[PDB]
């Protein structure tokens, strides 16, 4: 697929995210069953993150990077879509990656939305509204969305829309996941005068986010706030 390919309402379409209040439809590409790519900065899935400006108080991390123009033109969006698709193919080219992607596709968020135990019902926040050629829309279930970063362009992560208040990612049900990611940047690390300066392969970074996504789709993730201390052997 190319960014400029015409919509069909099936695998290329303008979509809206449920609960993403008054959003203008954004162009999205279904690169595989249950998995969509949205070449836009994520100003949608965090109600507290509706713009691309640096935060009032600086984030306490080793490095962050802001540029409200990144991922704003068609050319950049084409390159983002092509880069993400290429990383998927690279993951899929390994036995382990083919296994992980199959597990993701099978990992449909549970239909736990009924308040009556004799009926099975979808949880409608595990869906996107897909605009059709005629202007109508269809609510469609999906497992995973790959979306551009929010204000901090090099901040990658796997998240639910908003926060997982119903504990769907930790109760066996699972919910639709959004991976904020960019294939256009990568972190460096030192390894081995003779310390080589290397760069992380972005297929590994994507795989890490895909692993979080499968934990969260199978409802077996551990709360990210659950942190513990490991003391050193002091000397």
């Amino acid at each position: 697929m190319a960014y400029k390919d015409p919509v069909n309402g099936v695998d290329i379409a303008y979509i809206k995210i449920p609960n993403a209040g008054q959003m203008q439809p954004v162009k999205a590409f279904k690169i595989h069953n249950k998995i969509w790519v949205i070449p836009e900065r994520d100003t949608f899935t965090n109600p507290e993150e509706g713009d691309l400006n640096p935060p009032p108080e600086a984030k306490q991390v080793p490095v962050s990077y802001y540029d409200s123009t990144y991922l704003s033109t068609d050319n950049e969006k084409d390159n983002y879509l092509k880069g993400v698709t290429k990383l998927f193919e690279r993951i899929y080219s390994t036995d382990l990656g083919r296994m992980l992607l199959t597990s993701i596709v099978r990992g449909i968020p549970f239909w736990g939305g009924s308040t009556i135990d004799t009926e099975l019902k979808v949880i409608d926040t595990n869906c996107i509204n897909v605009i059709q050629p005629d202007g109508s829309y269809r609510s469609e279930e999906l497992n995973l969305v790959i979306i551009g970063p929010s204000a901090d362009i090099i901040q990658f992560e796997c998240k639910s829309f908003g926060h997982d208040v119903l504990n769907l990612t930790r109760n066996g049900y699972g919910s639709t996941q959004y991976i904020r990611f960019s294939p256009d940047f990568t972190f460096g690390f030192e390894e081995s005068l003779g310390a080589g300066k290397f760069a992380t392969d972005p297929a590994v970074t994507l795989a890490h986010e895909l692993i979080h996504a499968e934990h969260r789709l199978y409802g077996i993730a551990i709360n990210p706030n659950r942190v513990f201390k490991v003391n050193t052997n002091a000397y």
Binding site: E119, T186, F189, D201, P202
Partner: protein, 164 residues
């Protein structure tokens, strides 16, 4: 307060490798039993369902998708249950086999050895062109970019990495 690490269960299990050892056997077992009970509760919810809401799929179809997802057993009456050994295998696949450290080994790339990262160097890259990065070999293409991870070296393959 002592010196040492502050680490997250979810990160350690996702990265795998060496760091996974920081989660003790007891906690590993407690988590596993917890999620085995969650899966049994899903099987139980499915078994109570006799009808399906909405017109997008039939109940039999939807029950089959969740038997496949959770690898449930189904008896002749259509009742699902969670088999402990099938659960253990699946749970192992999803939390110990699918790990960043295991993908590093499949890709045969050089990478960090722990999820913790205090680096400040960040680079703009361009992987679309096959002259820069391939599905098969990543940055370590077959010029001498395929030896010693030279394709990932930001000095040697400097054209491919622009520092921010």
């Amino acid at each position: 307060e002592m010196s040492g690490l502050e680490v997250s269960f979810e990160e350690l299990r996702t990265f795998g490798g060496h760091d996974a050892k920081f989660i003790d056997s007891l906690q590993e077992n407690e988590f596993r039993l917890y999620y085995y009970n969650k899966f049994k509760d899903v099987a139980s919810t499915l078994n109570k369902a006799k009808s399906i809401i909405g017109t997008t799929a039939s109940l039999q179809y939807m029950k089959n998708v969740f038997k496949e997802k959770y690898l449930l057993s189904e008896d002749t009456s259509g009742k699902f249950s969670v088999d402990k050994l099938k659960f253990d295998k699946l749970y192992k696949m999803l939390t110990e086999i699918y790990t960043e450290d295991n993908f590093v080994n499949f890709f045969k790339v050089i990478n960090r050895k722990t999820y913790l990262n205090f680096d400040k160097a960040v680079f703009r890259i361009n992987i679309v062109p096959d002259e820069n990065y391939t599905i098969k070999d990543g940055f370590n293409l077959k010029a001498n970019l395929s030896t010693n991870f030279n394709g990932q070296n930001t000095e040697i393959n400097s054209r491919n990495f622009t520092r921010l």
